[PDB]
């Protein structure tokens, strides 16, 4: 069922979110706040149509997309940049490339049973997050 990412996922680990944020030029005051936050991620998946919501005490980030359809992503409340984003399946891994000002920007998201993994990349920095399927 490795492509079914539907549900609510609760963060349990968040490695080098700081390195990823610094690569995006996030201001120090925001990084100092955001590096501690536990995140929740809600995915509404209907085949290749995705509606996702990543939430916290500090800020939320929503992004909707269709696999294989390049779209104009505006990273509101993150680094507030415009990127051309494409999400595709590479095996059972959901792979997004975000081309714009920053090089080697994207993410990879996949399921392992009751765990959701998300690797965020920007240039020289990789952030590794693990979420647990909501109890
Ligand atoms: C980082 C600057 C200040 C943060 C301030 C606090 C925000 C924490 C929650 C949102 C954090 C969201 C990070 C990117 C997630 C992403 O875009 O990938 C998703 C798209 O679908 C994969 O599910």
Author numbering: 0 to 134
Give the published text.
A similar Kd was measured for 2-palmitoyl glycerol (2-PG; Kd = 51.2 ± 7.7 nM). The answer to this question can be determined from the structures of CRBP2 complex in these lipids. They revealed an unexpected change in the orientation of the palmitoyl and lauroyl chains as compared with longer acyl moieties. In contrast, the palmitoyl in 2-PG adapted an inverse orientation, twisting first toward the β3-β4 loop before interacting with the α-helices II and I. Thus, the interaction with the β3-β4 loop is prioritized, enabling the stabilization of the ligand inside the binding cavity and the protein as whole in the holoconfiguration. The inability to stabilize the close conformation most likely contributes to the rapid diffusion of the ligand out of the binding pocket. This hypothesis is further supported by the comparison of normalized crystallographic B-factors calculated for CRBP2 in complex with 2-AG or 2-OG and 2-PG or 2-LaG.
All CRBPs share the same protein structure architecture. Access to the binding pocket is governed by a “portal region” composed of conformationally flexible loops connecting neighboring β-strands. By examining chemical libraries of bioactive lipids, we provided evidence for the selective interaction of CRBP2 with a subset of nonretinoid ligands with the highest affinity for sn-1 and sn-2 MAGs that contain polyunsaturated C18-C20 acyl chains.
